[model samples]
Target chain A: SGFRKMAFPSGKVEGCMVQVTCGTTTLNGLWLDDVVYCPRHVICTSEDMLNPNYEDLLIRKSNHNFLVQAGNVQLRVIGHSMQNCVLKLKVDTANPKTPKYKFVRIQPGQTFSVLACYNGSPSGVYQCAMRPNFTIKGSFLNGSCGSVGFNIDYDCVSFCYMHHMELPTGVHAGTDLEGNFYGPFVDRQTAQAAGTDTTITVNVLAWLYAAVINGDRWFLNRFTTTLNDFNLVAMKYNYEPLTQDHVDILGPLSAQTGIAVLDMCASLKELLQNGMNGRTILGSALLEDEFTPFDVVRQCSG
Target chain B: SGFRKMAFPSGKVEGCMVQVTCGTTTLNGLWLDDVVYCPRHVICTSEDMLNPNYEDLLIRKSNHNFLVQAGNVQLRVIGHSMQNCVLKLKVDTANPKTPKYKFVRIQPGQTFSVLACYNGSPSGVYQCAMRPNFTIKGSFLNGSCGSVGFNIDYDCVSFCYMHHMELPTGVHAGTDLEGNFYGPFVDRQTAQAAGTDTTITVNVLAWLYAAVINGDRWFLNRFTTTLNDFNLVAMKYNYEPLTQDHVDILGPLSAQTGIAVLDMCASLKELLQNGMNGRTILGSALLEDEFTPFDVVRQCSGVTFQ
Candidate 1:
């Protein structure tokens, strides 16, 4: 269906803000007074449409009034193909003792604007609910209604942080008090030397894990490269003997590595199993622990 | 809130099919023949209701028949209220002639069935285009109409792929193959024995390209590792002097290596720029050749581990 117009107030707000949720079908375009415009898409269905649920679109007016903006706002109805439709606006302000909702109705094809003035400190988010009712098929029917909720967390930063670095050469010289290497070496010479020395033991454990968990070859290759890089970096840096903390962290990270590898392996296993026509003996059994089912535990012995 | 009844044909059609695209709302429930039931949401305002586009939703039943079977359907209308809303269904059989569309009005409220049989195929994908004429400020008015589009491609497969790799060791490998001998070896023994001699000369030109193009640490690291792995693998396999073709095929495969990643990057680049970023950069600065932006060049300089 097509939409005619949708609007919101322009200016500063005081307390919580107001926001509107228009049905996927009703919304046309959005604008700020007569200047700026916001483009939106309507995709929500009628059953999914509810009372606007205005927790995020609310804005507070400087005059202590709350202004809510409805998005994808459009009017709809069913029945007698009436030329006019009416909308009713309501405010629920009753306390725990009273608990009541207020209402106001507008004529068909007519626009209704209201400035919801509040008393007290304007505690909590304030919003107004709108419902449109019209006659369809010779009987009065009500279209889906929505509520606009306004809160205070509207203005916030909109930026993301990024980090960059260059590849290093030579064993990293940074260390802890025990003369143990603490970080990756900055140079490749040291990295290669460490890779050669038996002191640098490259752990393929993570690769195995990757092969198991995700059953993906890409993960396996990545896991393998990462393990190789870790060893190269560790050797280059002359990393200190594993402390209790390092050992603990290593266990999980290594498990992650294994999971990654496991994922690749599982995929491979499935391919093989399917190719072999589900023949266990010819498919997975031949692969052995080199490639195990995801459910099999402790496939690799340390 | 809940569904009533729905059915699917057990018999398969040879090639012909019927499809329907309901409006934004959904069909509450359905009954065979005339005993159909509609929920509250199914009925929509006809005043501003746009004719549902039929291009993607309409299906050809035969050379003379157009059919749409909806187990459950919903209609969502924008603006204006619907009163005595009627659904219009029609067909056109006249050849090379102005085809006309017909309408059938469906009411709101209790359950009902609607069936409109036609003698000929629909002229176009749109079987019916509806305009809801509503009263504005006590006056009757006509609003814009919404249309539907039929399905173009029906049988297609959707797949996802990705690549996983170890994080790169961000050691500076040096520019122009100089100062490349300063990095650590894989082990101490290899380091002392080969000592600079065993240092493999890795090409960072691609890494540089990766940095310039992607500018992401993860991508750079993965690319670096893959580039290094390519060199190592080539060396291990004794492949004489790696070729640009090898790197071209394998470079991206190593970085962000998944079917999914490859598809996304390839699709994004294809859809956005049609794969010209690398070619433009390489032809302009690296190759020192006269280049045009549209020139399509693929492949990377091969890497070798000494």
Candidate 2:
């Protein structure tokens, strides 16, 4: 889907009142007034190409997985392919007696984007077929020729709220969707807690499936520790975390089902992951419940 | 409004097999055969009256706040008022027993719920007017007299998925929407961990606004602790909980807005609460981000006391 989720910071950032001017605003990068650059794997939308913006929108990159900017414009670009496809600005004056029209083209990964200038067409139209046939199926096409096919792939580019906290002990740490390590936030258990600006945001994708592929033990221990922490906090406030059902369900399901503990963990892991990520992953069998089925458990575990 | 959110257990429970049998099924309690009981404070709907079914639905009560059951039927009754209103089954014989029509009445609490009898009506219709005159205004009425007016009120009756957890230390505890205490789960820190089933379910209503009115310190400490726990978990898993922004946002909003610290906590509290309850409480001003405004912060802080 062209719609990617990424957090638009609530307040001002580095002198830019992104929350003010750019709040609730969306931008299409490909059809900017000048050059339309489509970086490697960046997902661009056909809609954005037609409704390009005229304002100055800052561009920021995060691990090449996705691009985020905060200004009067919110960036919705996704990295569809790992291949870098750049389109440069060109003017057509073949009709010397007429006003020159603008267009964009990529030499020959062989793709070209038509600007709104030529024949009154909206800018950022990448031709699927022509001499420089730059069209991919299901997107946009015309003219006619064999077009090089690019792998239509995508990664998580979520919009999340970044929360700040002062750990009673160590600093916060983890990874984003691309398995990028975040922090080891300093451990402050031995001394008095200090006001260190430690911030953590839930990357929906990472919280959803990031920990699974990384390290099983690491993920399990982390899950337990956080759960325990939540329980601790909850208890102190007369609130509680019921681990009994989790434990019972975790145990019997693993033992009886003959499902590997790790595999079973995978199923429950996603449930907990979804819970931690702020979306309830309810199942049909479970109906409104938070638990996943055996198939999911076995599948994830395997 | 008709769609209520409740957790459908994933596995088997008792002998009913609620998960398998009534997993996705919904039931309207009013039309059940035998006797139709609409207890005080229970909320019934016009829709359930029409699509009445023939099935056994177990009934469970939680502080009279709402009714929950599992079987071929899942209860969707809500307590609309604090007043007890009961209806007894009756057969209309005046028609000289024309197939013996069945009906229900609350004799001058003056409300009656008609069964799918009389004129081939689908059971559970409370006439807005009649000789016995049993109708309120917008609900149902035909031939009537001045009916006693009743307040239409409702409380939280959410169907939440209950989670069971084994606390590393103490037992789980808290209050439901009606301020009912659940548990002080035993503190099990000194010895080897033995299996003690402790379960936790996020009560959306409670998680949303439960703690503020109960006690400021209790809610704040709990909120801070849970947040720290989430952060701890994330960090350990190579995942992190960004608390800096929360702290920064929390601190200044409290100080600059001149809002009471408790009030400020109430605002951020809901954000944290919603986050805990598995729902993202996004703000328009924040636009896709999660954070409530100062107004809400102030509103909740004064809510209980007010």
Candidate 3:
């Protein structure tokens, strides 16, 4: 059976037109019966009132200006609204001889900014559309909104309670637009000024003490008396000292927990270094106030 | 001005003797007054009864068996108690003319074992002393303890309620001997047998969903319908499914959360493959069950880390 691809009249295709049919005898032959052949569309008889599989037919007409076809099925099209106008279109039935639909709207949403914040108290929410995968492309809409805007796709954004320029620039953490945390923005000074006790608590030491002691509470009997001895000095004082005995005991733990040590002498630029003359060495007093054992210094460094 | 070092007698020492003194004129001289000079001790006269600085003096005595010196200060020495015996010692105060002194102990703690477990219902505790830095050196006290004993330094140990031999061996999480979590010992079969809902509850999905959605609870408006669509099927089913649209949206989230996707076809050994014929994909319904977003698979891979 010799066969060749056929080209029909220039783009006047229909839902019932027959390009090829199975069990046919010849290439150039046309089916004699009205039930067998039609050119109103692909694969149906013109004598038939409607295309049985019109739902499966592709709506080939698109891209016309201010006009379009919805075919014989339900469908949806997006239209941009400026002043909220109305819709109009025609159902051209008289052009059946020409018999072609080579068809399409215009207007896009406008852009603007609101004052956005109340003296940096409550956060402001900007939206493109109330839909997913759709983002309204916009930029720093006047930085007085009291928030540090990140480029698109930052997991966390820095927010300050004052105008952007009014606050010293630094990395800071805050409850995200999502109720989770976002930050470690390198602005330690602002964090300190923010006067949050997150860094001042000896939560790391306390947490570490619990982690280790829980493994073997009796293990403390060998180190020293009264877990209080560990607790008494585990405060937020600047030096934040620990004895060699406690240091030796807790050293392995400090490394394990990512709790850090800050040589007090080094910090003060004093004569004796850590462990020099048996002065107590310093551990970091600042810890993440939260109970989770994430490494704060390590995390903020990122 | 000349200075020379001096050597005392061969070994004979006294309660007090002086080898040198400062601000004196002659080498072979002595202090003239009783208040000044006495051989009872280095820094005081014999008439003074005690050396003024005796508290600071080096004991100069050690290395004796069953006899020792408890210098005139409160201090402690560890004694090995065997058979719960008592103590005895003699004070050396005789032969004042040729006095020398040096002092020491023995009898070590015994070794033994006890039946140790009530069929492993509760754990066993061992002690060297009720003190810190003191560990009683010992070994596994027989394995019927219904516990997989770990070496001394392991932070966690695996425990089972049944006898040790009665259970299949695997790394398991349990209340540590110290009441914390201990493992994820690579035994999927044992875990499945344990029938714990820890892996079945879609806590990770719920947690992840909350984590992502909390940042923007309204963000779901862009993804799918009600959150129930997510909640409805987020249970422990073998081929727990997610659609492509949801998968595409949740894929970034899965990577961020370490939540994994197990191609259902691969798990089922079917031909269609993931996304092959527009079927829903498989998400691990086996979640950590805890509210934390720690990757269950990644953590069990650890025992990065659970």
RMSD of each: 28.4, 29.8, 38.4
Model 1: residue B157 alpha-carbon error in angstroms: 23
lDDT of 3 by residue, B179-294 (tens): 22222221112322222221222323433343332221211222233333433444333323444444454454456544432321122222212212322111111122222222
Fnat per candidate, as a fraction, reads 0.00, 0.00, 0.00
Each candidate's DockQ score against the native complex?
A: 0.01, 0.01, 0.01
Give the candidate number with the greatest TM-score.
2
Error of 1 at A141 (Å): 41
User: What total of clashing residue pairs does each candidate reach?
Assistant: 147, 72, 26
Once superposed on the true structure, which residue ranges of model 1 sit more than 4 Å away at CA?
A1-64, A72-302, B1-66, B69-71, B74-306
Compared to the true structure, candidate 3 yields what TM-score? 0.16
Between candidates 2 and 3, name the one with more favorable TM-score.
2
lDDT of 3: 0.22
Off by over 4 Å in 3: A1-221, A225-302, B1-249, B252-306
lDDT of 1 at B135: 8
For each candidate, give the interface RMSD after superposing the true interface residues on Cα: 32.5, 27.3, 44.3
What lDDT tens digits, residue by residue, belong to model 2 across residues B105-162?
2221121111111111111111111111111111111211011111111211121111
What's the lDDT for all of these models? 0.20, 0.23, 0.22
lDDT of 2 by residue, A1-302 (tens): 00111111111111111110122222222222222222211223344433333121123322233333323333343322221122111111111222122222222112111111111111111111111121111111121101111111121112111111122321222111121222332211223333322111111112223223212223233222345544454344332243545445445344534444444334444444343232222101111111122212322332
For model 2, the DockQ equals: 0.01
